[PDB]
Design an enzyme around this catalytic site. Sequence first.
Site, short mmCIF file in Angstrom:
data_model
loop_
_atom_site.label_atom_id
_atom_site.label_comp_id
_atom_site.label_asym_id
_atom_site.label_seq_id
_atom_site.Cartn_x
_atom_site.Cartn_y
_atom_site.Cartn_z
CG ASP A 112 57.43 19.57 32.75
OD1 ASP A 112 58.06 19.16 31.75
OD2 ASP A 112 56.99 20.73 32.84
CB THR A 153 62.27 20.92 29.65
OG1 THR A 153 61.74 19.97 30.59
CG2 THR A 153 61.22 21.21 28.58
CB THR A 154 65.15 17.01 32.19
OG1 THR A 154 63.85 17.05 32.76
CG2 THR A 154 66.16 16.63 33.26
CG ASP A 214 55.82 17.02 28.13
OD1 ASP A 214 55.87 18.22 27.77
OD2 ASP A 214 56.10 16.65 29.28
#
Lengths: 518, 518, 518
Positions: free
Chosen positions: A56, A89-90, A385
């Site tokens: 994450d 998010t990445t 997630d």
Amino acid sequence: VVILPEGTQRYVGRDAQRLNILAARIIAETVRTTLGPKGMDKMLVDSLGDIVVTNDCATILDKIDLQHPAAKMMVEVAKTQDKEAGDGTTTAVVIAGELLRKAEELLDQNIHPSIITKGYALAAEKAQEILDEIAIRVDPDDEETLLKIAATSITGKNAESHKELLAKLAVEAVKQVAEKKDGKYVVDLDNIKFEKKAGEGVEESELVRGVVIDKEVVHPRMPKRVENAKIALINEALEVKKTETDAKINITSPDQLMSFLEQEEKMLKDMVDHIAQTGANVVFVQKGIDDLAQHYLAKYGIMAVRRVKKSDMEKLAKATGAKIVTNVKDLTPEDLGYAEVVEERKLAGENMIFVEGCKNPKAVTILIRGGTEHVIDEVERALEDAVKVVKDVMEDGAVLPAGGAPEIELAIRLDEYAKQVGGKEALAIENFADALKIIPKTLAENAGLDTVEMLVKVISEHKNRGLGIGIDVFEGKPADMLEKGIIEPLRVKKQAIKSASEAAIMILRIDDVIAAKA
Amino acid sequence: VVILPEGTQRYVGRDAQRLNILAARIIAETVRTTLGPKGMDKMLVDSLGDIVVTNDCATILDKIDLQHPAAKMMVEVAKTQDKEAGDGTTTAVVIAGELLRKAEELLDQNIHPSIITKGYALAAEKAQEILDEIAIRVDPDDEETLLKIAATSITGKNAESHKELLAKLAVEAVKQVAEKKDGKYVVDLDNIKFEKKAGEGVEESELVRGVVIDKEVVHPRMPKRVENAKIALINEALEVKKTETDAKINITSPDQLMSFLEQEEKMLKDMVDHIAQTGANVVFVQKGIDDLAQHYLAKYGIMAVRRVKKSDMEKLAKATGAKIVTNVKDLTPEDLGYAEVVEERKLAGENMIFVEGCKNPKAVTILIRGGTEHVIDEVERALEDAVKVVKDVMEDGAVLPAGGAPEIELAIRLDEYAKQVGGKEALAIENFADALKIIPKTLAENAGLDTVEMLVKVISEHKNRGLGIGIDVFEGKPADMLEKGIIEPLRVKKQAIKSASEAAIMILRIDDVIAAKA
Amino acid sequence: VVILPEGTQRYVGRDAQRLNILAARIIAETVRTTLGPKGMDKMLVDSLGDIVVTNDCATILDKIDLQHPAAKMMVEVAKTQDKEAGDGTTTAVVIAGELLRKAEELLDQNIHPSIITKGYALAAEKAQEILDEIAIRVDPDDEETLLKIAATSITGKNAESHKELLAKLAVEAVKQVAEKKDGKYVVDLDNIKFEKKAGEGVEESELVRGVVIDKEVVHPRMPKRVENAKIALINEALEVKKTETDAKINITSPDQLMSFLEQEEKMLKDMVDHIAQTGANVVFVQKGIDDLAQHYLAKYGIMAVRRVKKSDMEKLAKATGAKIVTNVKDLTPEDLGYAEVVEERKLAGENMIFVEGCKNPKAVTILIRGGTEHVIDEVERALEDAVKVVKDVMEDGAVLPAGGAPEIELAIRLDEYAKQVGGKEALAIENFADALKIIPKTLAENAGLDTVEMLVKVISEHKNRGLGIGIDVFEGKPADMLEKGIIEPLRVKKQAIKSASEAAIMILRIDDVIAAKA
Ligand SMILES: Nc1ncnc2c1ncn2[C@@H]1O[C@H](COP(=O)(O)OP(=O)(O)NP(=O)(O)O)[C@@H](O)[C@H]1O
Ligand SMILES: Nc1ncnc2c1ncn2[C@@H]1O[C@H](COP(=O)(O)OP(=O)(O)NP(=O)(O)O)[C@@H](O)[C@H]1O
Ligand SMILES: Nc1ncnc2c1ncn2[C@@H]1O[C@H](COP(=O)(O)OP(=O)(O)NP(=O)(O)O)[C@@H](O)[C@H]1O
Ligand SMILES: [Mg+2]
Ligand SMILES: [Mg+2]
Ligand SMILES: [Mg+2]
């Protein structure tokens, strides 16, 4: 002439731009290796020696102690993406870094940042229009798509071998607690609890249509299991109550020593007798429970638990249907909730309480098991997630193919949009478009595939077969993500581009960095 | 561009994998020498100078002050294995380390960690199916098998000389406190107390069908021995009670100085009179007992003990059949428990109380003796494992041969499974199967036998004679562990493979280690 | 009991083996990235700030400040390889490292080091017999193969751009100075001089059939160019000679002040007159030349150079055919050498002397040019290797295909040899064979190819098509290296295995490392 204190650092013009951009790029390069099915994990050890192992990006950037200001700004991109859409998010951080890298090329060409910024703004705004249009609309509660959404999310993390089970649990949990206002769903994730207990393996994880509480039955004589439980929820302590106004007993005769002692005993007994009179055979108390009260509860065959966390009280109410009562005296049978089974069981040799088999629970619990504490913390993150992307789709009945198909669709189209805009802005728009390709590129990269060739093939096939064409990192070639059931919420891409863009534009507008002495 | 704080160390890719795998392997190598009948012990001295001498892997890893993050992660494997199954804590850590060692060979071959990981997940899951299939279903309460189970875990420890006695005590204790709900037993280990006093030898250890408490009889005049005891359990203190609400006596005449004093005396005397009138001749009080009360208790010929531990009060309720009463006032004959004998005896010159000869005790006590405190602590650890494995079999009802037999079966079958899966994934499944062999290998190594030849002979015989064939470290040759009665609970292998594989896979996905400066 | 000084560190058994093997592997891993056509270079900076940029393994290991003993031992493999055959220094180091890695697998299996060592020695001795057999016997001076040998050596280094030219220069130089005793050539590399001058580009480098010397014509009036030069080589200084025995002039009359003065003038003039009378018009003096002597040489129209390096004097003799004379008086016309042209020319503004167009020079010069001093030095290094391999083939009329074909051929044959030997020794032989595959493996790895796949395909094609099948890192597939002209001297592979095997076996024999405090 001394203007700034000694120790102050200052970078201006291209120096400030070079520094900020290189720092954002390095942060992005750092987390890009966690991207996709073939993405890997990081081990983060803080100053106190605490260990975190994740895939994450949001968790990673939040943990490491970053120094450079521009690098810190990138953390906000991952944080906001995490709060809004859960996944991506990445993606948002990686695109933001690439956006800055592509922009410096224009900066080196001496194109004014206001021009690059204007171009990026046009491209980002155009990208939203495009996303809204190509988005595949679906039934917010369609189970098959939901399952695909969740499964796609749980890939490239060490709990993917159980993606089918985990996806199934996440989708059931969300749909069960989802609130249908009229024709649109709303989901409060605070109604889905995650309880972790090392032991067994991830396979043994399950969904409890009720609540699992890390507590024990207060008294040894109380039942350890109750079939058709009538649950009472009291938040006030079962103890001798005292007025809010200061008060003191003034004794003037010996017989009062016993009369007051007996009065407090009666008050305690009345509370318990009252609870018993409602028919309740299970009671959760948010505060304490005096020993005498415990004895009577036990004498009545009533199972009781004390010091229950407020958030658990609320989940208990939503699951069982019981209404939290403040004062025991206000408790009525209509306030009682229901559970097919309330039982104290041991997990990893630790007593816990299960409230299962609730009718139509508005709160639910996903019990996570696993061979180790770290493994279980990472499964919870993977579930956090999964649950968010399922929520995304139930609130936005829209999805998109994954595997870099969307960013490719955007690169192709935005490149075309640049042509209709023209001039230096067009340059910026083309670079913005080219930037969006780091996703497919990095997906292939992490998989060990030839990045240059994979790009040529995917873009070409995408142009020939349409929206769904993306990169299959397992088979190492282009594929129809839609046919493969590899999809993601529309919201992931939308928020990703918004955060990546506005942050890149902000960093690109900085031509002066003044940092005090720490 | 200074991104991370100075003093931060980072390892990436092959370097990360190499460092993490080496650390884990070294921890495994460190504990593997304690494995088996021929395993040796370790002496751990902490910063304060406290000394621990044990053969237990969990304890060892718990005590050692480990620095490396990967080494720390290996501690969790042992801990979870211990909480869930008791035995096999060394097995799980050793398998985990070997699993990692075999994986690095594939990493050095450039096979993607994603493939190795998937292959390992397939093997792990297949391993659980195989274990469930070859597991020998047995009678949950079959004494003979239960005895073989206990005796098997006790071998290879400091108290093995007395494995017969100790295995008998363990089996008897669990059986006694075991609860049958429906053909299936449930065991709460909290109902089995371990009391230890240095003195005599381990041979003098025994099972008390009741409770042994480290307390004295409160008053010198009370009976030191009561035959057919009528036991009262009270948690409130035997003293002048005070209201919860603040109160104070307002004295206005001299006669009150005595009247209030006599009222408090009467109150104490009433409490004691009430206890006496129920017919109780023994009383255990959780809180304190006022001197005056002790006096009246003594006058009544009632043996009393004060400040008794809560857990002890609960064990007394379960063993004697007494019901814990909160307030003396509520005590009645029906709350009284029974004990053939309650007596204060001195062990190594220290007073203790024995509550023995209980009817159908639901809580029991294993009194451990030994020539040294260190000896006794280790005997306790041995008994903790024995009681846990006996529990595993009564709750489950499946056992497996020992001596590396299950792992050989697994290696043999996973090897074939590899072939049906084929590809790079089969390579990983193959390495996983090969890894399982460190068990038979180390069982032999610790015994000083030729590892290479023992492995050849055992695997061959196993293929010829079946599941029960494992290594016999005493005879120094393959043998049918089943015939020898060398068996272990199914739960041990299942948990060991789960924790070892999920931890290995997780460590395997790490390709970035970022540690802050302490 | 204090036997070793404090500060002394010691590692025994498995620990010593693990540490030594890990250190040697890391070193090998550090240089393998320079291997082959797609191999890259390293920039080495010492403590003084001196910079070295190269691809040459021997140079790299020599210039790096290694600390671990095992790593230092690897340096010797590169140095010995470099001295005996030139190329293959990386190959040798890489194989040694791989050999040690494969050996540790057997050590972990508890196979005794003497057995592993025994198998390795057998495999290495067999390898030499195989290389001698498969070696392709070629014509010692076949310009065609020699050119292929040189070109193959030069590729994979900057300045591979000009491999055609550089190979041509290397071959012409060696062919020219080679001495044929009887079908058997012998080459003394000291007869080939490398002169470097920054300026122009690598393309301007050339072969001078004579000698280039970094010197100037001592007197301004002397000729700067002489057509058909008659060269005199004198090592004695052209100055007033003094006896070896101490001596002093004892002056007793005023007229002696002039007579001794004039006598020294005459001695000096006579020396010069003598040189002129031989017919010499060019003179190289190893020591100095007094101004008067210079003056008369100029008057005579004779070009002279003083303080010429001894090594340059020998090269001028072999090149021009002149004979070095100690005393001027012994000089005769028969002692003079010949040069089509001798001229002082400026290179990068610095004066130099060219002695070109010599009849059949036995000493030659390769003038290296390039746009930077660093480029110049790395070109010299490439030429040193190119010249050594050409030499190898002329002395040993034998070559082998490149592209990892040799090691593949050995791996296949050694694997079969293993079965013939059987036992635990067969285990080591099989591992030795497998170890030889890192060459084909890293050749591909450095090219970005899929290692596992390339190996499968090349080994397969090699089995179908034979000896010349290796890896074409450019086309990214197996190919016949012989057809492609990609070959290497037999001596390279022969020495590589010898040095790598003996080093590996030596390290593998170490089970105790004792290092004192520095
Ligand atoms: N089976 C699949 N094949 C190819 N691409 C996939 C697959 N599943 C997911 N993806 C893509 O992988 C990316 C998601 O990778 P991931 O490592 O989870 O990072 P992220 O979603 O950007 N951020 P985060 O999950 O918040 O850490 C998206 O671009 C997906 O479309
Ligand atoms: N008589 C026996 N002969 C051969 N092997 C045995 C025998 N008794 C036990 N074993 C094996 O020895 C191992 C148990 O050794 P032990 O040292 O107790 O470590 P562990 O069970 O792995 N961990 P722990 O008990 O948690 O400290 C198992 O693999 C058994 O199958
Ligand atoms: N065109 C080519 N295609 C494939 N392999 C080649 C080619 N040319 C050379 N090689 C191989 O590349 C290796 C030589 O690489 P190189 O980087 O020069 O290291 P080295 O010769 O081992 N040591 P060094 O002394 O440093 O040059 C040999 O194994 C050759 O057979
Ligand atoms: Mg994701
Ligand atoms: Mg054990
Ligand atoms: Mg070379």
